[PDB]
């Protein structure tokens, strides 16, 4: 029973429990002392009965006593027990010191193991560490005097957060922690600002987007949890999936498009036939503009097989590839081959490449060949200029002539509908059938239409070229997209579900580059508030199943 | 039949 | 607490009647920095001042106390503290003890 | 209760206490 | 139609 | 065209005219709140109808009666500012006229002996000002409208998903707006069962044995007889040629089918059949045979029929037998089979049984269950079928009678049972609980009429039971009515009220969106966990209704909603949608207002449907809607259109452009954070937008919008003086207009509210013009962000996933900086030791941090101050502190020791510097008024004097000027006029008495336009000299405000009006940023990667669309800058608008010369384009606009790398996009804590960033951990982090000193559990 500000008092409910039962035994007390009736006394056996009971488990035995604010008052069972009770809020879960929390930014300069830490978040965090040191070599004679200075914010401080936070690991979270990825550790490194810079190759571990995501980061302060965090915790340890053993550190979005870009093939490029000594006048060639990236040359590549029993066996020979494949291969470590990077790379092929380096090399090779990789992909991708406008957004010809034969034969079985040939659910079964097949070949006339060009080759004909549209490539390179969202921006939405789940006859025969009207829109909201509630319940469905499960 | 003990009192 | 129904105003208090660990350490520093300056002194003053104040000690003592161990009288004890006083004022030996006011 | 989990880091540790255990029931 | 096929063969349900 | 829109004409490539404007935004709520206070003669809303309801109060005894009379509403102590200032509740007094008959007891009763009338002051009913917000205790609130059950009868089933088989079991419920609740079930037997209140089930028979029915009449009512009859020595069905339509049939002459059509048979007609005695075994009877001569029951009614009874019939010379119909199809024994499970016989029994299940554990008397059963449902006081629940009750069962009737009876139970069975039988259907024709809108008329009359409840009983004692001599009915429980309910409901929230106010679209926005939740609606799927989805009558897009993401999808754009609620609070008439095949102009059910029946075509020249529709078959399913229909068969393209979207969604190439799931997110926005310092107009905005901008009342036109006399940052034309003065009027502006005003979010004005000094205005632009607001268009250059390709990763990558320029011309306003507050008080006393003697500080404090301890206005600088300087009395022997050492030595009163001083908070713009001292009465107090009060009443000064004089000279025009009627000189001195005017003397009469009338107005303007300065002087009314134990209150300047910065959230959300990721320099050929940089870098997979194309076109709208600009800017004829000018701007075949005719011919050069002058910035949804820009016009630029009809240009030089491989789409900075900021996320407070009973670190607590290391963080392995990390993070208050101090001192170790301990969260189990009498013990 504490006071507040302002005069009033805070009070728990077990105070009113208790002084109800105080009360009700004082005056069963005072009753026998006085040889009451009967019936008096009975009733206020009652009621101590009922107000010990709703001290000890409220609302058990009968209505639950409430208060002054019509709600029944807390219990012990109720303060011990529960989602909110003490074991789940205060021992199996805790809210600690030494802790922050911020939004994050991506880092494309960082490595594996590093992390971007604001200077006054690790001024707060780190403060012991700081009076400590400055008091060891003497420039504060006592604790008063180092909190001041830190408070003034002296360079002396700054140079002696940089010296304390030099190789002392943080730890990074990010709620929901699903898996143990959630929490990694990380060595900081103080930037101007007030996010914290992430390494965009843990975010699949950490399930995490830039799009106002908030971290919070842990100091551990005895050796043991520093050991801890470097030895077990560290981002550089963990780099396979715990569920399945497949690598979790795989690059996505730009450094996948890039890599991709840089990999691919053209007809009749500039610096086509050249021969080439090696990476290096691959890369002499592209940047004095002898030859484009995708020109198809013959590179001299020395190439080294680490066998399985530990045959280190290098070969030097002439091998047909492209400028891009040789550049990016002279990252790649020793002891691959170079068929690996001989052919376009998506994402399945840099998976591959990043568990073949695990595999015969090691753990050092693969987070430096990981950390070139994003290095190499984020510069190539952003020299690819590779952009979305809606001229790339092309809707097949055929489109509008298969949207008519089905509307024409439509309108043919609805005429034998009203000449009771078939019935309204067979009628309903076939309208519902063709116009999945017509959204099919709409799909696949788009997809045929948008996958290849015609070229003009060194001899004059013309060849047949996988098409450079940005959204194929970015479909094809498994970046971002995939086969049925160039579907509905470019073919056909399809047909879409009814509240109860029920598909109405008539689909959406637009797509999102023509523009939807208003009843495709009212149907396509149908889905969407669907699957956004789906979503919700699900998340805490599964929730409650990885407790059961833990 | 009951279980609150006003009604019993009455 | 405001329109949430998870969150509690028992969840708002604080401990007012805690000690920072900031002011205990800065007790202990301040420990160590008088027996460091009071080792400066000798036996008699020093031992005058930590009688006289309960320093390492449970109790504090008046004059008479502390002029019976040495069987001198009160206004010896008095003069004593008063020359310690005055040499501890002195700045070649009270610049660390400053810097706690 | 606040102490070492039996698993990991703590493991030797509860190991050797449950050794302790025994040598001192004997 | 999967989640829920999950929770009750984790829980041994007993089928209708 | 208006002043304000023909300044800056934006260009519209819609195709569709519009028959009908958007009405106001604010109706929902100003109409139902002139509902609630307005008069009604007939008394059926607001007050009155509460008032009537609950008044007469009549006596137990009947001694005397307290009848209504009339009411009042009082004129405010505050307005509206004032309120805000102070920190009170905006409102009006209440003043009921009552009279208090005393009747005589000699005399019959009904004898009027007295009466006494007072007026009675029954509490203080808010107000809601002119935007449709409330000021509760000092801030603005808005109360949501809801979506409830409506009250009346639904009937539903389980759809077999109880029961083991499918067994789809049919329940009807009756629900009142008050009273309880009437189920009628069946159960897997088919049993009609019935439960009150939700309780223990029973035989539906009982509520008819209740009202006095005996069990013949229950079969009569729910069963059709066949009678069986004895003739000529032979059996006799009375044969109805429906049944017929297992034996032989007679009529021998027309011999039926035998034991194997009918209507041939019956085409001649018969009235006898013989069917064998068998026919007769399996039925049941009807009613009960009585034999006089034996008095004895031979059979009863619902028995069934045997040899041995059909014997007895015979002996006992009965004839004539009727038996109850029964079939499996279309007709069923149900009722026949609840009688005979039901044990009930009498009306006696039915009320104790019913009184059993009602009040269990109690002895049943017959007068007790009579009570209970007529206040459950047939009492007025108790139940409350209201209106619009009488309206859908009897239209569910058909009735047509009962219209004001409230409360149930016979027919409508036994209607409701019947029509329950039929729908169980096949004829009939169950009612869609989703439909918007059974949910209603209650909006803040109803609540409070709701909340009104339970306070009068409250006072009626009191009231009842001091007119039941019988000392009234000298007893007047003020002394009967208290005011306190009536001012309690209506204070609960507008400020503790789930639906009474904070106001959102970061921009004009926010504060309308909140007040046309509508929940499920709150009181008597859904709760968020128990909520389902079914009532979170769309349904079709939400169609042009509830928004589908607008809604949170997350725990309340669905159950809250936005109003459409055309919705509107009709008198019964459904919601109802305009629609266009077709009349003889054309589209007619009219517009009818339909609602769920009556949208039903009829067939609506969309806006999309193409129209020819004769207003009918083109094509034959024409894209409609019947019953909630789309198809294709008929011409000759539509009877309704839709009267807009953005009838199904709301505001917000209506606000996107291009929102027909977005997906529903990324429109949902970008009318969400399009009410995120923060205004910034310089209201930059969209380039491409809807033209919906100059709607939002007028109709939220951010805006100063003029009241009368006229033109403008005086114009100044904060005061807009405008000359009435002379067609629009009120008789004996000033003739002017005062538009004080809002300057630099905190918002609820902390943001800032400022007035610009917009207009020039003589500058004529018309009603409706905008003179002030408020918040996010240009020219009277809403302007939520900034149009910034675009560039849409990847940048070296710092663009990857969701971040974006912002130009150093960007924050150079301060394009996204944003005012924040902070309000800090010192409190003095009275404490035990005594009294807080604010003053600059601050104890252990030094003269360096009171500089910028004043003599009275207050903080100067207008200075600079940082974290941690001393605002109001504060000293409290504090105990006797015991010392510990060091420092009674060091105190020794040093005689420095000033400890009586403690520094808890009003400090700026960490990380916030800003500016001092106002300071407010609050006093209580009776308290020394420091310095400062009296120097603002000083300034207030100077700035009183010179305000009243000033607006007396600007008037006085409009009303001289029209006494002026009064004497120029015959026109003179005035010149002699001004010969005598202005006061000597006075002094004058006439003899005629024609002419001093005038004098002395003049003189005696003269001299008393002096008494009422002192009183309002009086009254002025009043407001600002008097005390404020404090909480008990405070003494004086220092509010200080704080302005800071927020730049953008790495972490800042940034996004469009298309979903595309994210957070700056660097600021690179202008060098490092792509260049044109032109060498004009992009100030923003976008990934394209997330355009494809969320299917947002509404953004590249846009940006498309920006880019020519801009080059448009550019060459406008050119035109004139170039100092070109204006007769080019005009011929560009005629082309530039006559683009497309839409629906706008913008001709220049009647544009004056001026006119063209302001519109040419702010379209220097860019060309403003409006499309509409769903009636947007085609591709094809945006190529024109582009080819028009001279600008790639691709929209994408050249790029070349600022850091090399060399021009990106391809093409990179370049434009312009409207962007918005959230209130998502980096410096309100950002926290860290080493050390600080803790709880008081967990000692556990606090929580929030405003307490400086900590992260919380949650379970899934520990199971992370123990899969790590990391024990010891685990046992810090539990013990010396959060709860071990040794080992943290341990710890702490360990890590000061070097020694990185810990000793970890027993967390107080164990032993805090250990005590409570101990507590719990159950003994827990650590064994050793
Ligand atoms: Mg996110």
């Given at each position: 029973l504490v006071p507040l500000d302002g005069g009033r008092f805070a009070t728990s409910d077990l105070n009113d429990l208790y002084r109800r039962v105080i009360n009700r035994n004082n005056r069963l007390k005072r009753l026998l002392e006085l040889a009451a009736p009967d019936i008096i006394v009975r009733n206020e056996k009652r009621m101590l009965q009922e107000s010990v009971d709703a001290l000890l488990d409220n609302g058990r035995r009968g209505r639950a006593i409430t208060g002054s604010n019509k709600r029944p008052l807390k219990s012990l069972a109720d303060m011990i027990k529960g989602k909110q009770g003490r074991f789940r809020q205060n021992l199996l879960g805790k809210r600690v010191d030494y802790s922050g929390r911020s939004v994050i930014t991506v880092g494309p300069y960082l490595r594996l193991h590093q992390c971007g830490l604001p200077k006054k978040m690790a001024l707060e965090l780190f403060k012991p560490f700081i009076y400590s040191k400055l008091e060891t070599r003497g420039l504060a004679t006592t604790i008063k005097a180092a909190k001041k200075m830190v408070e003034r914010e002296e360079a002396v401080v700054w140079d002696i957060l940089d010296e304390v936070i030099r190789e002392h690991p943080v730890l990074l979270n990010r709620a929901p922690t699903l898996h143990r990825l959630g929490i990694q550790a990380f060595e900081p490194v103080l930037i101007e600002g007030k996010?914290?810079?992430?390494?965009?190759?843990?975010?699949?571990?950490?399930?995490?987007?830039?799009?106002g995501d908030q971290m919070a980061v842990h100091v551990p302060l005895t050796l043991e949890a520093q050991l801890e965090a470097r030895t077990l915790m560290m981002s550089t340890n963990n780099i396979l999936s715990p569920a399945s053993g497949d690598p979790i550190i795989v690059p996505s979005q730009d450094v996948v498009l890039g890599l991709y870009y840089m990999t691919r093939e053209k007809i009749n490029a500039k610096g086509e036939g050249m021969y080439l000594t090696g990476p290096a006048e691959a890369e002499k060639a592209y940047r004095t503009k002898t030859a484009e990236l995708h020109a198809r040359v013959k590179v001299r590549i020395t190439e080294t097989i680490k066998h399985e029993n530990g045959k280190l066996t290098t070969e030097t020979k002439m091998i047909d590839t492209t400028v891009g494949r040789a550049m990016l291969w002279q990252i790649v470590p020793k002891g691959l081959p170079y068929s690996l990077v001989n052919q376009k790379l998506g994402k399945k092929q840099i998976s591959n490449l990043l568990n073949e380096a695990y595999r015969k090399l090691g753990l050092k090779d693969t987070v430096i060949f990981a950390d070139q990789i994003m290095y190499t992909g984020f510069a190539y991708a952003a020299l690819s200029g590779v952009s979305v406008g809606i001229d790339d957004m092309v809707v097949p010809a055929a489109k509008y002539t298969e949207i008519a034969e089905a509307e024409?034969?439509?309108?043919?079985?609805?005429?034998?509908?009203?000449?009771?040939?078939?019935?309204?659910?067979?009628?309903?079964?076939?309208?519902?059938?063709?116009?999945?097949?017509?959204?099919?070949?709409?799909?696949?006339?788009?997809?045929?239409?948008?996958?290849?060009?015609?070229?003009?080759?060194?001899?004059?004909?013309?060849?047949?070229?996988?098409?450079?549209?940005?959204?194929?490539?970015?479909?094809?390179?498994?970046?971002?997209?995939?086969?049925?969202?160039?579907?509905?921006?470019?073919?056909?939405?399809?047909?879409?579900?009814?509240?109860?789940?029920?598909?109405?006859?008539?689909?959406?025969?637009?797509?999102?580059?023509?523009?939807?009207?208003?009843?495709?829109?009212?149907?396509?909201?149908?889905?969407?508030?669907?699957?956004?509630?789906?979503?919700?319940?699900?998340?805490?469905?599964?929730?409650?199943?990885?407790?059961?499960?833990? | 039949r009951t279980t609150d003990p006003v009604r019993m009192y009455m | 607490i405001?329109?949430?129904?998870?969150?509690?105003?028992?969840?708002?208090?604080?401990?007012?009647?805690?000690?920072?660990?900031?002011?205990?350490?800065?007790?202990?520093?301040?420990?160590?920095?008088?027996?460091?300056?009071?080792?400066?002194?000798?036996?008699?003053?020093?031992?005058?001042?930590?009688?006289?104040?309960?320093?390492?000690?449970?109790?504090?003592?008046?004059?008479?106390?502390?002029g019976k161990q040495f069987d001198v009288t009160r206004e010896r004890i008095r003069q004593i503290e008063a020359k310690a006083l005055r040499k501890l004022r002195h700045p070649s030996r009270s610049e660390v003890l400053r810097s706690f006011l | 209760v606040g102490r070492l989990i039996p698993a990991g880091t703590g493991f030797a540790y509860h190991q050797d206490r449950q050794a302790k255990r025994a040598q001192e029931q004997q | 139609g999967g989640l829920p096929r999950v929770a009750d063969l984790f829980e041994a349900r007993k089928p209708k | 065209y208006s002043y304000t829109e023909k300044k800056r004409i934006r260009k519209d490539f819609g195709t569709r005219p519009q028959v009908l404007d958007i009405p106001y935004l604010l109706s929902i709520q100003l109409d139902s709140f002139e509902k609630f206070i307005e008069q009604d003669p007939e008394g059926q809303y607001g007050l009155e109808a509460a008032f009537r309801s609950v008044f007469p109060i009549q006596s137990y005894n009947g001694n005397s009666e307290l009848q209504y009379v009339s009411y009042r509403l009082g004129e405010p102590v505050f307005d509206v500012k004032e309120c805000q200032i102070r920190g009170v509740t905006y409102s009006k007094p209440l003043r009921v006229k009552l009279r208090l008959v005393i009747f005589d007891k000699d005399a019959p009763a009904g004898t009027v002996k007295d009466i006494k009338e007072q007026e009675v002051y029954m509490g203080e009913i808010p107000l809601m000002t002119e935007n449709g917000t409330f000021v509760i205790n000092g801030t603005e609130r808005v109360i949501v409208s809801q979506l409830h059950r409506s009250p009346g009868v639904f009937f539903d089933s389980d759809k077999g998903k109880t029961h083991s088989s499918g067994k789809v079991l049919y329940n009807a419920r009756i629900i009142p707006y008050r009273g309880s609740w009437l189920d009628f079930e069946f159960d897997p037997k088919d049993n009609l069962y019935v439960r009150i209140d939700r309780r223990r089930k029973l035989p539906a028979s009982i509520i008819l044995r209740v009202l006095g029915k005996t069990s013949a009449e229950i079969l009569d009512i729910f069963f059709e007889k066949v009678n069986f009859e004895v003739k000529d020595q032979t059996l006799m069905m009375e044969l109805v040629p429906e049944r017929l339509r297992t034996f032989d049939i007679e009529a021998d002459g027309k011999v039926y089918v035998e034991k194997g059509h009918i209507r041939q048979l019956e085409k001649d007609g018969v009235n006898f059949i013989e069917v064998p005695v068998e026919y007769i075994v399996g039925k049941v009877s009807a009613k009960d045979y009585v034999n006089e001569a034996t008095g004895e029951l031979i059979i009863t009614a619902n028995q069934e029929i045997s040899l041995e009874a059909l014997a007895n019939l015979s002996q006992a010379g009965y004839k004539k037998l009727e038996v109850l119909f029964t079939n499996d199809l279309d007709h069923g024994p149900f009722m026949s089979e609840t009688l005979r499970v039901d044990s009930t016989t009498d009306r006696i029994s039915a009320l104790v049984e019913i009184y059993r299940m009602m009040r269990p554990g109690e002895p049943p008397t017959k007068e007790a269950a009579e009570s209970l059963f007529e206040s459950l449902f047939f009492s007025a006081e108790r139940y409350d079928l209201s209106t619009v629940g009488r309206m859908k009750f009897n239209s569910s069962i058909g009735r047509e009678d009962?219209?004001?009737?409230?409360?149930?009876?016979?027919?409508?139970?036994?209607?409701?049972?019947?029509?329950?069975?039929?729908?169980?039988?096949?004829?009939?259907?169950?009612?869609?609980?989703?439909?918007?024709?059974?949910?209603?809108?209650?909006?803040?008329?109803?609540?409070?009429?709701?909340?009104?009359?339970?306070?009068?409840?409250?006072?009626?009983?009191?009231?009842?039971?001091?007119?039941?004692?019988?000392?009234?001599?000298?007893?007047?009915?003020?002394?009967?009515?208290?005011?306190?429980?009536?001012?309690?309910?209506?204070?609960?409901?507008?400020?503790?009220?789930?639906?009474?929230?904070?106001?959102?106010?970061?921009?004009?679209?926010?504060?309308?969106?909140?007040?046309?926005?509508?929940?499920?939740?709150?009181?008597?609606?859904?709760?968020?966990?128990?909520?389902?799927?079914?009532?979170?989805?769309?349904?079709?009558?939400?169609?042009?209704?509830?928004?589908?897009?607008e809604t949170p993401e997350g725990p309340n999808i669905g159950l809250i909603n936005s109003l459409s754009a055309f919705a509107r609620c009709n008198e019964y609070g459904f919601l109802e949608t305009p629609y266009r008439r077709v009349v003889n095949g054309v589209v007619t102009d009219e517009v009818d207002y339909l609602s769920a059910i009556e949208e039903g029946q009829f067939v609506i075509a969309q806006a999309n449907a193409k129209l020819t020249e004769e207003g009918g529709f083109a094509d034959?078959?024409?894209?409609?809607?019947?019953?909630?399913?789309?198809?294709?229909?008929?011409?000759?068969?539509?009877?309704?259109?839709?009267?807009?393209?953005?009838?199904?979207?709301?505001?917000?969604?209506?606000?996107?452009?291009?929102?027909?190439?977005?997906?529903?799931?990324?429109a949902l997110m970008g009318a969400n954070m399009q009410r995120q926005a923060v205004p910034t310092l310089r209201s930059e107009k969209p380039l491409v937008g809807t033209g919906i905005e100059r709607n939002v901008a007028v109709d939220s009342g951010v805006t100063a919008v003029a009241k009368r036109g006229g033109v403008i006399?005086?114009?100044?940052?904060?005061?807009?003086?405008?000359?009435?034309?002379?067609?629009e003065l009120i008789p004996g009027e000033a003739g002017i207009d005062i538009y004080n502006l809002t300057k630099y005003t905190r918002s609820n979010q902390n943001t800032c509210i400022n007035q610009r004005p917009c207009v020039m000094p003589g500058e004529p205005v018309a009603r409706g013009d905008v003179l002030a632009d408020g918040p996010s607001t240009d020219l009277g268009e809403l302007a939520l962000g900034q149009n910034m250059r675009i560039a849409f390709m990847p940048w070296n990763g710092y663009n990857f996933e969701d971040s974006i990558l912002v130009s150093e320029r960007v924050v150079q011309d301060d394009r996204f900086t944003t005012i924040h306003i902070q309000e800090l507050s010192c409190v003095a008080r009275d404490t035990k030791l005594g009294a807080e006393e604010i003053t600059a003697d601050i104890?252990?500080?030094?003269?360096?941090?009171?500089?910028?404090?004043?003599?009275?301890?207050?903080?100067?206005?207008?200075?600079?101050?940082?974290?941690?600088?001393?605002?109001?300087?504060?000293?409290?009395?504090?105990?006797?502190?015991?010392?510990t022997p060091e420092e009674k050492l060091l105190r020794a030595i040093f005689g420095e020791k000033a400890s009586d009163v403690k520094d808890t001083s009003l400090r700026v908070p960490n990380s916030v510097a800003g500016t001092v713009i106002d300071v407010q001292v609050f006093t209580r009465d009776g308290v020394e008024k420091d310095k400062r107090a009296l120097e603002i009060e000083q300034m207030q009443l100077k700035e009183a004097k010179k305000d009243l000064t000033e607006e007396f004089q600007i008037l006085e000279g409009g009303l001289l000027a029209r006494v002026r025009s009064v004497l120029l009627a015959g026109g003179y000189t005035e010149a002699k006029l001004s010969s005598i001195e202005r006061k000597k005017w006075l002094e004058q003397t006439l003899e005629n008495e024609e002419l001093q009469n005038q004098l002395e009338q003049l003189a005696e107005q003269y001299d008393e336009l002096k008494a009422d303007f002192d009183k309002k300065f009086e009254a002025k002087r009043r407001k600002?000299?008097?005390?404020?009314?404090?909480?008990?134990?405070?003494?004086?209150?220092?509010?200080?405000?704080?302005?800071?300047?927020?730049?953008?910065?790495?972490?800042?959230?940034?996004?469009?009006?298309?979903?595309?959300?994210?957070?700056?990721?660097?600021?690179?320099?202008?060098?490092?940023?792509?260049?044109?050929?032109?060498?004009?940089?992009?100030?923003?870098?976008?990934?394209?990667?997330?355009?494809?997979?969320?299917?947002?194309?509404?953004?590249?076109?846009?940006?498309?669309?920006?880019?020519?709208?801009?080059?448009?600009?550019?060459?406008?800017?050119?035109?004139?800058?170039?100092?070109?004829?204006?007769?080019?000018?005009?011929?560009?701007?005629?082309?530039?608008?006559?683009?497309?075949?839409?629906?706008?005719?913008?001709?220049?011919?009647?544009?004056s010369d001026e006119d063209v050069r302001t519109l040419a002058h702010n379209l220097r910035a860019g060309l403003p384009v409006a499309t509409p949804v769903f009636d947007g820009a085609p591709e094809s016009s945006i190529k024109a606009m582009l080819e028009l630029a001279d600008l790639p009809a691709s929209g994408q240009l050249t790029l070349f790398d600022g850091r090399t030089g060399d021009a990106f491989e391809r093409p990179v789409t370049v434009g312009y996009m409207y962007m918005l900075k959230l209130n998502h900021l980096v410096d309100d996320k950002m926290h860290a804590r080493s050390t600080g407070s803790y709880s008081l009973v967990t000692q556990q670190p606090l929580g929030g960033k405003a307490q400086f607590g900590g992260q919380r290391f949650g379970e899934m963080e520990v199971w992370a951990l123990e899969a790590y392995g990391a024990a010891y990390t685990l046992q810090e993070m539990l013990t010396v982090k959060s709860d071990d208050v040794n080992g943290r101090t341990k710890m702490y001192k360990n890590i000061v000193d070097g020694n990185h170790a810990m000793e970890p301990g027993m967390p107080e969260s164990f032993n805090v559990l250990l005590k409570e189990i101990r507590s719990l009498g159950i003994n827990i013990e650590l064994e050793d």
């Open positions: 996010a914290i810079q992430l390494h965009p190759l843990v975010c699949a571990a950490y399930n995490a987007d830039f799009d024409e034969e439509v309108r043919e079985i609805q005429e034998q509908f009203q000449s009771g040939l078939v019935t309204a659910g067979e009628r309903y079964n076939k309208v519902i059938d063709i116009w999945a097949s017509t959204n099919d070949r709409v799909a696949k006339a788009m997809m045929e239409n948008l996958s290849s060009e015609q070229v003009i080759n060194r001899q004059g004909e013309q060849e047949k070229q996988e098409s450079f549209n940005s959204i194929y490539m970015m479909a094809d390179s498994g970046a971002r997209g995939s086969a049925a969202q160039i579907r509905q921006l470019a073919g056909m939405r399809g047909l879409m579900a009814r509240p109860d789940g029920s598909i109405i006859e008539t689909p959406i025969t637009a797509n999102f580059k023509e523009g939807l009207n208003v009843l495709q829109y009212f149907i396509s909201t149908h889905g969407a508030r669907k699957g956004l509630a789906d979503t919700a319940l699900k998340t805490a469905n599964s929730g409650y199943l990885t407790r059961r499960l833990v | - | 405001g329109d949430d129904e998870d969150s509690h105003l028992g969840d708002f208090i604080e401990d007012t009647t805690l000690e920072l660990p900031l002011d205990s350490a800065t007790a202990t520093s301040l420990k160590a920095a008088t027996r460091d300056v009071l080792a400066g002194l000798t036996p008699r003053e020093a031992k005058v001042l930590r009688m006289r104040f309960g320093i390492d000690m449970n109790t504090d003592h008046t004059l008479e106390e502390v | - | - | 009962a219209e004001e009737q409230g409360t149930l009876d016979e027919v409508d139970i036994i209607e409701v049972m019947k029509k329950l069975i039929s729908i169980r039988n096949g004829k009939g259907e169950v009612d869609d609980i989703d439909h918007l024709g059974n949910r209603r809108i209650r909006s803040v008329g109803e609540m409070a009429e709701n909340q009104f009359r339970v306070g009068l409840v409250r006072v009626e009983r009191a009231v009842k039971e001091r007119l039941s004692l019988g000392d009234l001599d000298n007893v007047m009915p003020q002394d009967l009515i208290n005011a306190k429980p009536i001012s309690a309910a209506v204070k609960e409901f507008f400020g503790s009220s789930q639906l009474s929230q904070f106001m959102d106010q970061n921009n004009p679209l926010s504060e309308v969106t909140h007040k046309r926005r509508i929940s499920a939740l709150g009181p008597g609606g859904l709760t968020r966990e128990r909520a389902g799927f079914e009532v979170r989805d769309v349904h079709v009558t939400h169609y042009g209704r509830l928004c589908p897009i034959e078959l024409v894209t409609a809607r019947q019953k909630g399913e789309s198809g294709l229909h008929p011409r000759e068969h539509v009877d309704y259109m839709d009267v807009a393209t953005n009838q199904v979207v709301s505001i917000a969604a209506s606000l996107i452009p291009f929102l027909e190439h977005d997906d529903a799931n990324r006399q005086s114009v100044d940052a904060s005061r807009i003086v405008v000359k009435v034309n002379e067609e104890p252990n500080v030094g003269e360096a941090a009171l500089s910028k404090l004043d003599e009275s301890g207050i903080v100067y206005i207008g200075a600079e101050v940082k974290g941690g600088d001393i605002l109001v300087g504060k000293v409290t009395p504090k105990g006797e502190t015991q010392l600002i000299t008097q005390g404020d009314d404090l909480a008990p134990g405070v003494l004086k209150i220092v509010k200080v405000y704080l302005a800071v300047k927020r730049r953008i910065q790495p972490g800042d959230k940034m996004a469009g009006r298309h979903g595309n959300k994210g957070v700056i990721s660097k600021i690179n320099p202008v060098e490092d940023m792509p260049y044109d050929e032109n060498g004009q940089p992009v100030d923003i870098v976008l990934n394209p990667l997330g355009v494809p997979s969320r299917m947002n194309i509404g953004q590249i076109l846009e940006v498309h669309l920006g880019l020519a709208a801009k080059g448009i600009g550019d060459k406008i800017n050119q035109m004139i800058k170039e100092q070109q004829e204006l007769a080019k000018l005009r011929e560009f701007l005629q082309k530039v608008y006559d683009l497309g075949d839409t629906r706008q005719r913008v001709d220049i011919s009647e544009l």
